[PDB]
PDB file of C-alpha atoms in Angstrom:
ATOM      1  CA  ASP A   1      59.574 -17.998 -48.416  1.00 21.16           C
ATOM      2  CA  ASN A   2      60.072 -21.310 -50.112  1.00 23.34           C
ATOM      3  CA  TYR A   3      62.591 -23.526 -48.333  1.00 21.25           C
ATOM      4  CA  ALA A   4      60.550 -26.622 -48.904  1.00 20.57           C
ATOM      5  CA  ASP A   5      61.202 -26.618 -52.603  1.00 18.24           C
ATOM      6  CA  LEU A   6      64.742 -25.437 -53.633  1.00 20.46           C
ATOM      7  CA  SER A   7      67.422 -28.100 -53.567  1.00 20.97           C
ATOM      8  CA  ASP A   8      70.857 -28.155 -52.624  1.00 21.30           C
ATOM      9  CA  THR A   9      72.218 -26.100 -55.274  1.00 21.52           C
ATOM     10  CA  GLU A  10      69.883 -23.234 -54.287  1.00 21.90           C
ATOM     11  CA  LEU A  11      71.158 -23.838 -50.793  1.00 22.04           C
ATOM     12  CA  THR A  12      74.548 -23.002 -52.256  1.00 21.26           C
ATOM     13  CA  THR A  13      73.118 -20.374 -54.758  1.00 15.71           C
ATOM     14  CA  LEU A  14      71.684 -18.947 -51.286  1.00 12.26           C
ATOM     15  CA  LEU A  15      74.580 -19.804 -49.220  1.00 12.20           C
ATOM     16  CA  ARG A  16      77.116 -18.786 -52.007  1.00 12.39           C
ATOM     17  CA  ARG A  17      75.207 -16.043 -53.715  1.00 11.17           C
ATOM     18  CA  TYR A  18      75.082 -13.797 -50.771  1.00  9.71           C
ATOM     19  CA  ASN A  19      78.509 -15.245 -49.231  1.00  9.00           C
ATOM     20  CA  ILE A  20      76.977 -16.295 -46.039  1.00  4.04           C
ATOM     21  CA  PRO A  21      79.515 -17.855 -43.745  1.00  4.88           C
ATOM     22  CA  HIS A  22      78.777 -21.408 -44.789  1.00  2.52           C
ATOM     23  CA  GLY A  23      81.174 -24.714 -45.127  1.00  2.00           C
ATOM     24  CA  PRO A  24      80.160 -27.857 -45.804  1.00  2.00           C
ATOM     25  CA  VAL A  25      76.243 -28.061 -46.758  1.00  2.00           C
ATOM     26  CA  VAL A  26      75.297 -30.983 -44.575  1.00  2.00           C
ATOM     27  CA  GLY A  27      71.860 -31.871 -43.355  1.00  2.00           C
ATOM     28  CA  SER A  28      72.336 -30.822 -39.741  1.00  2.00           C
ATOM     29  CA  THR A  29      73.530 -27.175 -40.710  1.00  2.00           C
ATOM     30  CA  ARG A  30      71.295 -27.249 -43.732  1.00  2.00           C
ATOM     31  CA  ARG A  31      68.334 -25.209 -42.344  1.00  2.00           C
ATOM     32  CA  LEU A  32      70.816 -22.854 -40.247  1.00  2.00           C
ATOM     33  CA  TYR A  33      71.686 -21.779 -43.695  1.00  2.00           C
ATOM     34  CA  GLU A  34      68.188 -21.750 -45.494  1.00  2.00           C
ATOM     35  CA  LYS A  35      67.307 -19.663 -42.110  1.00  2.00           C
ATOM     36  CA  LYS A  36      69.878 -17.161 -42.202  1.00  2.00           C
ATOM     37  CA  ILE A  37      68.834 -16.355 -45.689  1.00  2.00           C
ATOM     38  CA  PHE A  38      65.638 -14.936 -43.898  1.00  2.00           C
ATOM     39  CA  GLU A  39      66.493 -11.643 -42.333  1.00  2.00           C
ATOM     40  CA  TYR A  40      69.260 -11.414 -44.963  1.00  2.00           C
ATOM     41  CA  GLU A  41      66.357 -10.314 -47.012  1.00  2.00           C
ATOM     42  CA  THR A  42      63.773  -8.847 -44.909  1.00  2.00           C
ATOM     43  CA  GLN A  43      65.750  -6.525 -42.346  1.00  2.00           C
ATOM     44  CA  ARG A  44      69.327  -7.194 -42.742  1.00  2.00           C
ATOM     45  CA  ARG A  45      71.775  -8.677 -45.228  1.00  2.00           C
ATOM     46  CA  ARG A  46      75.373  -7.477 -44.966  1.00  2.00           C
ATOM     47  CA  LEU A  47      76.126  -4.429 -43.010  1.00  2.00           C
ATOM     48  CA  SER A  48      79.514  -5.789 -42.552  1.00  2.00           C
ATOM     49  CA  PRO A  49      81.643  -3.866 -39.944  1.00  2.00           C
ATOM     50  CA  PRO A  50      83.008  -0.517 -41.094  1.00  2.00           C
ATOM     51  CA  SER A  51      84.899   0.457 -38.145  1.00  2.00           C
ATOM     52  CA  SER A  52      84.120  -1.906 -34.909  1.00  2.00           C
ATOM     53  CA  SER A  53      80.727  -2.758 -33.996  1.00  3.11           C
TER      54      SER A  53
END
């Protein structure tokens, strides 16, 4: 998509706009957040658990 142009704000606008379980946006767990954000919009996104699993 474009995880080589956006900056931190967008990460949080992509880790806080969908509400992905993200804590501190640090280097290590930086891609894991810009990477969850991939299926989140191309096959899955929330599908929260209505009953169990």
